[PDB]
Amino acid sequence: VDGNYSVASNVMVPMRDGVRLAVDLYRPDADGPVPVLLVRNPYDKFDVFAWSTQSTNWLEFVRDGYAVVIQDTRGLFASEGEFVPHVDDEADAEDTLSWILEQAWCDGNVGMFGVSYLGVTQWQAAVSGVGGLKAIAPSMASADLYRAPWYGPGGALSVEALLGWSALIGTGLITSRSDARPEDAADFVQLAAILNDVAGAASVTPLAEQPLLGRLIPWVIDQVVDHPDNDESWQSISLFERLGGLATPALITAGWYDGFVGESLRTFVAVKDNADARLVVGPWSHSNLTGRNADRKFGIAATYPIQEATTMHKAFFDRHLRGETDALAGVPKVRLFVMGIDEWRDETDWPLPDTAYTPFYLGGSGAANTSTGGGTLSTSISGTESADTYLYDPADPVPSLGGTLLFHNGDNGPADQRPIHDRDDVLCYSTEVLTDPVEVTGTVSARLFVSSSAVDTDFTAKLVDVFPDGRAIALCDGIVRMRYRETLVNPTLIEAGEIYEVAIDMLATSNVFLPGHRIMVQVSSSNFPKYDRNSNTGGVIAREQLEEMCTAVNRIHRGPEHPSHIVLPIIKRK
Amino acid sequence: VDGNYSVASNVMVPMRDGVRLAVDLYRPDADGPVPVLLVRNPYDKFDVFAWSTQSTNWLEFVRDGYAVVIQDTRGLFASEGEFVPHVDDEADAEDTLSWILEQAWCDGNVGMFGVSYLGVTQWQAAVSGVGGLKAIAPSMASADLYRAPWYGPGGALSVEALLGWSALIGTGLITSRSDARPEDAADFVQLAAILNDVAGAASVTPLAEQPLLGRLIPWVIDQVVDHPDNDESWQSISLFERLGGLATPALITAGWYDGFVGESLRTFVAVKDNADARLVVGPWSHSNLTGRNADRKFGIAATYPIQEATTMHKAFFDRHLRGETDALAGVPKVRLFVMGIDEWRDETDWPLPDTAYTPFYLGGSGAANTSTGGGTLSTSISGTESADTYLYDPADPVPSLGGTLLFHNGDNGPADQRPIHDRDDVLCYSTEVLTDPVEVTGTVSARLFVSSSAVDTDFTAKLVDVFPDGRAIALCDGIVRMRYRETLVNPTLIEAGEIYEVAIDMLATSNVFLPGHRIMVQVSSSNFPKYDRNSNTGGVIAREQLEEMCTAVNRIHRGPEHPSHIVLPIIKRK
Ligand SMILES: *C1(O)O[C@H](CS)[C@@H](CS)O1
Ligand SMILES: *C1(O)O[C@H](CS)[C@@H](CS)O1
Ligand SMILES: [Cl-]
Ligand SMILES: [Cl-]
Ligand SMILES: [Cl-]
Ligand SMILES: [Cl-]
Ligand SMILES: [Cl-]
Numbered sequence A, B: 001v002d003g004n005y006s007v008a009s010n011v012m013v014p015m016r017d018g019v020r021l022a023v024d025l026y027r028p029d030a031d032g033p034v035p036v037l038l039v040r041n042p043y044d045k046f047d048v049f050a051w052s053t054q055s056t057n058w059l060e061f062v063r064d065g066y067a068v069v070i071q072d073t074r075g076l077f078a079s080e081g082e083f084v085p086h087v088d089d090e091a092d093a094e095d096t097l098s099w100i101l102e103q104a105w106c107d108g109n110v111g112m113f114g115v116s117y118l119g120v121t122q123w124q125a126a127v128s129g130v131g132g133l134k135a136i137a138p139s140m141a142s143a144d145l146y147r148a149p150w151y152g153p154g155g156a157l158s159v160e161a162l163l164g165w166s167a168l169i170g171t172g173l174i175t176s177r178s179d180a181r182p183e184d185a186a187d188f189v190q191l192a193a194i195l196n197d198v199a200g201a202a203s204v205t206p207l208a209e210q211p212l213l214g215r216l217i218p219w220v221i222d223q224v225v226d227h228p229d230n231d232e233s234w235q236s237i238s239l240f241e242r243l244g245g246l247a248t249p250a251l252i253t254a255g256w257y258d259g260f261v262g263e264s265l266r267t268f269v270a271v272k273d274n275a276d277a278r279l280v281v282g283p284w285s286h287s288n289l290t291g292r293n294a295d296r297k298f299g300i301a302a303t304y305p306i307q308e309a310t311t312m313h314k315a316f317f318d319r320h321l322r323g324e325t326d327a328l329a330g331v332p333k334v335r336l337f338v339m340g341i342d343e344w345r346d347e348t349d350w351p352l353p354d355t356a357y358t359p360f361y362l363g364g365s366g367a368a369n370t371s372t373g374g375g376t377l378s379t380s381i382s383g384t385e386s387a388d389t390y391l392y393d394p395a396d397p398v399p400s401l402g403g404t405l406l407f408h409n410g411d412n413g414p415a416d417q418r419p420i421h422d423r424d425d426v427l428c429y430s431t432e433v434l435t436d437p438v439e440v441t442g443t444v445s446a447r448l449f450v451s452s453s454a455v456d457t458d459f460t461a462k463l464v465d466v467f468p469d470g471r472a473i474a475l476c477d478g479i480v481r482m483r484y485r486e487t488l489v490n491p492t493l494i495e496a497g498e499i500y501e502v503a504i505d506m507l508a509t510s511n512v513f514l515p516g517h518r519i520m521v522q523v524s525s526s527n528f529p530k531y532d533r534n535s536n537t538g539g540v541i542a543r544e545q546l547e548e549m550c551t552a553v554n555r556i557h558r559g560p561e562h563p564s565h566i567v568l569p570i571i572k573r574k
């Protein structure tokens, strides 16, 4: 009967080492084999409502004749083995895909879909060389775990992401084990305390001493905190350099305030030339898909459009798993939620063709410290040679407000920045009030001429849309940890007092700055706990006590010989 | 096989009039008949992810051997017939329950669960007299549709709820019909415009002229706007007076910032003496179950505890549908999220035994207008005879901020009230800063001595927790429309200048006002668009143009002879 299906729970699938992973099979009433979709989940395959609202109404797929397999990853819930993030997922995906392809009910065409870890695992599957995998759909994901979510392109630890997620998994690991232990109740309370106060958890020094999390999930220290360089341990689990050799269609979803946005977009660029890639980007953060935020509403159209996503995914899988050649007729290659105008818009590529990568130079009379300083932004190079100076004290970092926070206040991406505008270590540069709209849609970066009293420090840059009523709404931001200014792999220290030209990768955005608005940039040396705080010593940061850390006098140089600027991806549409 | 199940889609169930409703059947692998749970849904039975995250992980029930039936209500999606809210649901539930009880796979025990309209429909089923219905679990629901969600105990129209919901249903009605009409695209755009600006939609006068909504869903005017009195049309669909005669166990869930909270709690009180009733109340609004709000976080424990809810529901159904006499061992009768301390706490009854209903009298030197006026609250009667006076202008009502908003900014219940504290028509009365905690948990009401220059007007009261940092966080509120001061059924006008003692039903709350806080009350004559604005004419409010409305000089009298007060349900726990 068309539209009917069955569900078989805890089918045990043997991996190459004999360890069995548990899957649930959602199989249509059909007269032969069918195309199959696989989801690999570390958050309990039974708990479909927890993630599915951030993905698709995928029971539609089953009603329409796809089978869906949802698997508990190794060592969690109904699966056997031991859980360690990332390290087993390439092999376990390969073995699971192979098993699916052998089954009586599989017609030789397999795809995947899902969000976050259920997205990362798709890239890990895609590099398997299993020919039967015909398409993937990774949402809010990455193919380079160093670059997102654990560190970043600037070489700072994403400490709130790490501690928050590890606490969440710790809840899952305890729930997963054989029998209830006497210490479980107390552990549950302590994990809740982390999740209620992630900045507090991230503030304890040395950062690497994590009695609870290090016991429940040793990986948090053994892999993540202990490997600050993008070294061989990270390379082993990175998929990114293999993506260029694939020819697998990928339906990639991202969010402008999502921790993964830079890496999600990079995956699109990596695969678009060799296969049918699609891109959808909304104004979401990882835990807030609503389009509504404390000081910024994007409209109901911005709410994660789950039924349209379901329709698009089905069309995509119909094309690539069922060979229906016209199934993607009328579906755009790229679909972006353009903020400011707050509208969805179709595009033919990402980056947009006809992006003008335009320098906006830092300038102004007098000090740019605070929002009431003299800092300006202009497409003209600054005429006078100036410098703005501030003290960065690791004991008092600039607090994270919105942006791409994951677990610490991760539900307010477009946050009003006014609460930090009176800080002397927040340098502000803005355009005059705009008389005509300026669209910035693309990857964003800064090139700053900087110096420090320290042998290492950080520099941050954050793009902001200043509204007529004074709201200073965050758009995108990044950081550079100076030891990693030239390479994430082979860091070197800097010379105190020397001027360096450094790049800051500020991920990406899509925003029309409307008439009456200003374009604004904040520059500082911290953004905590989005990123851990540089100790300004040149030491092993995660092993330092707060008292061992140093203050730094940091300086931004601007003028004709030191033309510090932000590069904005300008789109002009007449 | 234990834990396995099948799903049959669009099984057509004939009602007494021959109209067939569509259901989906989730049936366990079992060797005989099983207990059955029914959900009646006007938002597409296929779309399980849309509502289920506000309810239960109910596939657990199916894995554990319950069948679940999800039905499209009459006239929507796969069902035949014509949709009109509420009026067919008693009969259609009775006929559906009868059909279920006849099936080979039903063991004679049926229950229900679900939220909002999926909760209201359970009360409509419970009055059917079908013996096979053994238990219900209505969450965020009402048994009196006048009192919630469409009007209220004060006799004001809940206009934002009506217009928002009607626009949402209008999206569903268009999606449900036979073929795509030329006007659908434009209608979709107009419905989105309402949902993006519900206060704007509610501001158009006469309110009763609704070209779009009145066309798509005539009921919005024909029933709701046209029947402002709690008359026979409302009585026909009310279940409340029948609840006392039932002996059906009910697991009732509510939220302190939920539009239905007063009516949800009343249902518990109505059924607790004759059957096993249970109550769970969290700090949620109808669309925000997260525990996180713009200026108030309740902690991760406050997040809707879906797996604990699932466990509790299964225990409840095991007791009442499977006759497992000890299934509810250790489950409390009442479980409340107590705000302020921000902790869950078990109780033996609602209202709490040992509630001290305590008057806090309005007082103060000079005018109480604005938060910087002299208004005080005290357990002692005020010594001097005073009055506070303000102008209520319907063209400039007090804006709704938090509370029990449903569709207009309905995701910030505990909203900071400071943005309206400089208004001359917002009278503020507060205690001194507290040195010891004061717990207020229970139903809340005010008794005000009032007068007006008009023959009708409204009075509002709102309880507020003032935090040390100045946040003035809304707790609960109500309104009295003066023509309905003595009865919602047979209104009469007032005499200009005469003093009336009136009651304002402020629903309920649970809050510990901690040391360093104040208890605060705001009094006014509007709260828009939570409630429509009184025209101050004595006319048919929804038929008046704004220009036809009048301003009113309204007065609150306070002193020994006019002891205006709020009655707080004080709990003292040593
Ligand atoms: C997703 O499920 O949430 C996490 C946020 S850090 C991420 C870990 S790879 O996957
Ligand atoms: C629930 O589904 O949401 C509505 C809020 S007004 C309500 C109508 S009875 O049911
Ligand atoms: Cl293992
Ligand atoms: Cl262990
Ligand atoms: Cl906005
Ligand atoms: Cl749009
Ligand atoms: Cl100098």
Ligand SMILES: [Cl-]
Pocket: A499
């Ligand atoms: Cl130089």
Ligand SMILES: [Cl-]
Pocket: B019, B074, B075, B080, B081, B082, B083
């Ligand atoms: Cl009908």
Ligand SMILES: [Cl-]
Pocket: none
């Ligand atoms: Cl019609």
Ligand SMILES: [Cl-]
Pocket: B295, B296, B297, B298
């Ligand atoms: Cl708070």
Ligand SMILES: [Cl-]
Pocket: B301, B342, B343, B344
């Ligand atoms: Cl608690």
Ligand SMILES: [Cl-]
Pocket: none
């Ligand atoms: Cl007078």
Ligand SMILES: [Cl-]
Pocket: B499
């Ligand atoms: Cl009198």
